[PDB]
Symmetry: D2
């Protein structure tokens, strides 16, 4: 019962694949009715089918989190489709590496709008709905770059470090509305390591030596973390970021 | 299933009351067979009765974690009573305030032996058993004093700050044995606020204003946190400390 | 000699008053030739007069750090006026409180462009100059909001938390160019507490009780911190943020 | 003037070689009269000669920081030789690696007594002297193990993590006596890498790849850091730990 989400209503952004898909499905498996977004509705087909496998309802909507209007209207539409809204997972994110001397304005904007600004304005919209009803839980997807710096991932790291600041300030501000706000910093997860960058085997060997568990994360390594942060088991946890990283941050 | 502990075998030290009692009972409620210790067996009567209410087995043993021998022999005896050992909660702790100019050797020792050294040597003993079988999970009880300083609680804060260091180093060292090592830093919990210190109402008002949730922790605010850190949902979490503090650390 | 900045060439942004003015003057007092910027040249009159009091050269230029072009051209112009550039202090910042349900797009942008994006693009420009010569030091002005959350200061906290991420990633990326990148998080400084918000005396009493030194910062409490981070005494410090806060973060 | 220590009176423990020797000499070079301790007086010959090179007075005394009595009496004797005491550097430390399954009671004690307990009781003694006069500054030597875990360095990491907790709590408690308490976490310094462990060249290559500056620390990389934390430039810094690590902690 303490981890059960039966009857909760969740929105998970950028949920067509990877982490967001894992989280969305795990929320449905724990009892929740789940709305999922992506750039196109058609890219959600696998996520929708995996959710409806649980028996629960899946709402699916188009959304670009860079459009501040769509952050609000598509969040309100998600609420209407579910009959309410008391869980938000801000997963949507643009990943990028680029030498910092070569970052132009446009790149900066695409990264920060998507990863930081978008999550704020989705939070604001879901928050207002939660505040008018009986509260809820928000989970932001941060990164190892909220704790350390990756060279050539400067705008990205700014984004995710900023989002951790957002997590703490919103937690403090919205506790009085019964809204908890927490974050997960995934380490290196197989399902997020699509980019050509990651096949470089010397890189892989080097990174694995920094991870005590000597493995990259599977979907089972994060879904339950998101359920936990949304559940009554986490009633006294707010403004906190749980790293799911196989021990990377703890390790020399 | 991801949060289920059925068939796991747990040891929780200093479990006669408070946090340790809460954790022990919540482990039993999640499926585990639980061994509990305290200075005397007789003080465990309430904890034993609450566990056996779940239908599960409760082993109960006398242990002073200041005796390094009892850290080993009573841990091995707990294993024998359960038929194994794959969860350890190091809860045992001596709390104290004393102006630092007035701390003598003996006080220092009592606090650090109990809170830090004891937990190391219990970890070592449970660890070796886990390492010879198929691994397990260890959860250390840290404190807000692992993050900030409380005036006149210097030895205590050294203890709990040290234990966070222990959590990180053991996590890194023992991941190769399939042993995860994590911690919980409780904030201010009603069940731990027995000492005369805490009735000072100006203190209470001042502390509550630093906690976004404007409340002190209940047993439901930590039991599920310990279950989570022991479960398959936390398979990729190691060397981490989850604060359960109503937002205190996140807040200005 | 280890703290001496004789012959160094510095740029300090948003230096007409407050922290930035304090830092700029302290750099000049430690030996540096200093360029200072603000929205208008005329607002720099006090800062210029205090610098020229040291005997050293003061260059003064108009700059809006929200204009990415001015981040580059006015930084290059500062270099030309000084005959080089090997210190950058990113001080420029827009402070704001606003209930998060009431933050609109425009406010978000003004805060984040000024505080985070501006500092990145100034860093990039100063960085490229330093990288083409013999390196240098960059100091970013962060805030307590890089560590905790202030309710109704969400965009601001995102900005300053992001800038700490920027500090770490740039440090890691640019060490190979002999460019150190560090930050200072001022606590509550008298010279920065202009806004009407801060006269609320109950607030003042409450904040002072959270600061072990029971006082707000003076200009002498930060100038030397900036000199230090720029000096040979800090040759092995990079990617770090020094809080100057009278013990706030360390304290319960 | 802001970094000048003329007329200050300092005690640096375990100062015969390495970090402690570097700090002691740098304090003397910045103006201070310096007392230095070690197990034997004869081992201080090089440190004494380097101090007296500055023209300043060097007091030298035998001290085992594991003896709580010697923590007090030898600190009071250092005061008498100097004519006062307003700087303490707790440098004394026993380094060790040992598989945690193989740590016995005696080893634990030697490590924690030396590294944590000793520094507390030296702080207490220097503190009381400072509190009876006009205050002062204390600097504790922490380690990367205050932030991350090194496998087989568990007792050591407990010690140094604990000492960071001590730094924060003492800072909070003793600010009202005009005593600032801060720490330095050295990274990997050439002068501290004596143990046979460190010649393993694969280790060296691996560690250097984790350090952005791609070098180990020299004595010039820490001496100025200690002077800074003792100076008027650091008047608003207390309870803080400065890592001198070539960017290790900031870096992925
Ligand atoms: Na690490
Ligand atoms: Na707080
Ligand atoms: Na604090
Ligand atoms: Na690192």
């Amino acid at each position: 019962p303490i981890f059960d989400l039966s009857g909760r209503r969740a929105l998970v952004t950028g949920a067509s694949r990877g982490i967001g898909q894992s989280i969305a499905v795990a929320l449905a498996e724990a009892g929740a009715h789940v709305a999922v977004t992506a750039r196109t509705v058609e890219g959600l087909a696998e996520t929708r089918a995996l959710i409806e496998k649980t028996g629960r309802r899946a709402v699916a909507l188009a959304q670009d989190v860079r459009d501040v209007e769509a952050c609000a209207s598509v969040t309100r539409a998600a609420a209407e489709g579910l009959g309410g809204l008391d869980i938000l997972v801000n997963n949507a994110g643009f990943e990028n590496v680029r030498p910092s001397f070569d970052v132009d304005e446009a790149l900066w904007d695409t990264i920060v709008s998507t990863n930081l600004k978008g999550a704020f304005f989705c939070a604001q919209a879901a928050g207002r709905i939660m505040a008018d009803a009986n509260g809820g839980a928000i989970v932001n997807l941060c990164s190892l770059t909220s704790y350390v710096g990756i060279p050539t991932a400067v705008p990205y790291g700014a984004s995710k470090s900023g989002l951790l600041g957002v997590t703490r300030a919103l937690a403090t501000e919205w506790a009085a509305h019964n809204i908890r706000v927490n974050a997960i910093a995934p380490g290196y997860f197989r399902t997020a390591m699509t980019a050509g960058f990651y096949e470089d085997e010397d890189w892989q060997s080097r990174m694995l030596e920094k991870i005590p568990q000597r493995r990259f994360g599977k979907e089972s390594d994060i879904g339950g973390v998101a359920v936990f942060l949304c559940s009554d088991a986490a009633a006294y946890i707010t403004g906190h970021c749980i790293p799911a990283d196989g021990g990377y941050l703890a390790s020399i």
